[PDB]
Antibody, heavy 216, light 219 residues
């Protein structure tokens, strides 16, 4: 089983540097790896490529001279040194094999992606407020994750057990420069007090984790 | 650099009907051999890109025969014989002939469903947030189609403007619906100055606009 796990993402100042670490397992040194990034809401943009045969590296014009792709075959890791970072570099960075044509079948393996955000703002942990259900004014309830930076936060329900009918919305940049989103879940109206609903908010950049019980 | 141009950018297709996306390059993608270095990629909502067609017309492993690619040189076309609900996402064409590799603009495939009126919900601010000097009242529209909707905030029948923001999810891969949340944020002083808080929803699946409301001071 081939698995690509990207790491190194987080917040960095304009002109600062980040070092992305892409790890792999199963079937790595034999294929050319690539980096593909995507600004939030925009399309995919190819960044750089390294070839299996040592170092035969190519870069896009937008990142040429500033980023450096490399690989450590002794640790089975793909690296991307990002120097002189600017605000337009804010994107989720994927490491990918692109096309691997072996035998007569074509395969493709992508990583989960790691978010790089370029800004001078400081890290802030989120406040979690309950959205409790009621009536006389199907039933819905959720959690409001307000005033955090930077992206992302991960929100699950009942430690990931409840998944049907859950809607976590894209974060919205408030006027204060802080993000905000809500995660709601719709349940059949007759199950009031039939189950217990807790939301698990995790904001790794601030090392904050909140478990908020939601009840009417 | 080779410029990859996709057309169209958005493609509404009813399930069971064909879909066709074109990809034009500013230079021939044919090498000295007989392979066209053009790939097609699909990115489903919330997932990483997934390879569909490689080298112009070769179907990748796991891709159903409903997907097919054709073309040579500077004009290629991706075809879906019968689109399904799970085909929601953005389709990109990438060239791998000469460096730098370049992707297209992307084609967002919208699945044309039957009309479904939204379920509107209203959420009052919590007492915990009211202690912080701010109040957030949230309005929820659950599983509707099409995406077009008007959400207006009225406080004591006074239409609000400038203090609300909307957030819409991608089309669901199962029922091809959208969900939308609109948050109205006021300070604790302004929130306590009024009594009736309501969000009014206008949608084509609703004969007349629907309003969910509440009066502050109730649990």
């Amino acid at each position: 089983e081939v698995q690509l796990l990207e790491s190194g993402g987080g917040l960095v100042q304009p002109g600062g540097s980040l070092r992305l670490s892409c790890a792999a397992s199963g079937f790595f040194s034999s294929y050319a790896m690539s980096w593909v990034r995507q600004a939030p809401g925009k399309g995919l943009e190819w960044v750089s490529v390294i070839y299996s045969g040592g170092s035969s590296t190519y870069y896009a014009d937008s990142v040429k001279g500033r980023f450096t792709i490399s690989r450590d075959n002794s640790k089975n890791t793909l690296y991307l040194q990002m120097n002189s970072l600017r605000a337009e570099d804010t994107a989720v960075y994927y490491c990918t094999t692109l096309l691997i044509l072996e035998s007569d079948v074509g395969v493709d393996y992508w990583g989960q992606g790691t978010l790089v955000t370029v800004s001078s703002a400081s890290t802030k942990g989120p406040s979690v407020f309950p959205l409790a259900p009621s009536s006389k004014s199907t039933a819905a309830l959720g959690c409001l994750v307000k005033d955090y930076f930077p992206e992302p936060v991960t929100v699950s329900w009942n430690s990931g057990a409840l998944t049907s009918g859950v809607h976590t919305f894209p974060a919205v940049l408030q006027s204060s420069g802080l993000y905000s989103l809500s995660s709601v879940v719709t349940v059949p109206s007759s199950s009031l007090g039939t189950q217990t609903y807790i939301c698990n908010v995790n904001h790794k950049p601030s090392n904050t984790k909140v478990d908020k019980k939601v009840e009417p | 650099d080779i410029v990859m141009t996709q057309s169209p950018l958005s493609l509404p297709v009813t399930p069971g009907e064909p879909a066709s996306i074109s990809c034009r390059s500013s230079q021939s993608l044919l090498h000295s051999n007989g392979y066209n270095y053009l790939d097609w990629y699909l990115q489903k909502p919330g997932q990483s890109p997934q390879l569909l067609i490689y080298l112009g017309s070769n179907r990748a492993s796991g891709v159903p025969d409903r997907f097919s690619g054709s073309g040579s040189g500077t004009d290629f076309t991706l075809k879906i014989s019968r689109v399904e609900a799970e085909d929601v996402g953005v389709y990109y064409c990438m060239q791998a002939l000469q460096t730098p590799y370049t992707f297209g603009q992307g084609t967002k495939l919208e699945i044309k469903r039957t009309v479904a009126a939204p379920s509107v919900f209203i959420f009052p601010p919590s007492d915990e947030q009211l202690k912080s000097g701010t109040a957030s009242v949230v309005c929820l529209l659950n599983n509707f189609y099409p995406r077009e909707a008007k959400v207006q905030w009225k406080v004591d029948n006074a239409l609000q403007s400038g203090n609300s923001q909307e957030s819409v999810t991608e089309q669901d891969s199962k029922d091809s619906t959208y969900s939308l949340s609109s948050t109205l944020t006021l300070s604790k002083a302004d929130y306590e100055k009024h009594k009736v808080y309501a969000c009014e929803v206008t949608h084509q699946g609703l004969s007349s606009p629907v309003t969910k409301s509440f009066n502050r001071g109730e649990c």
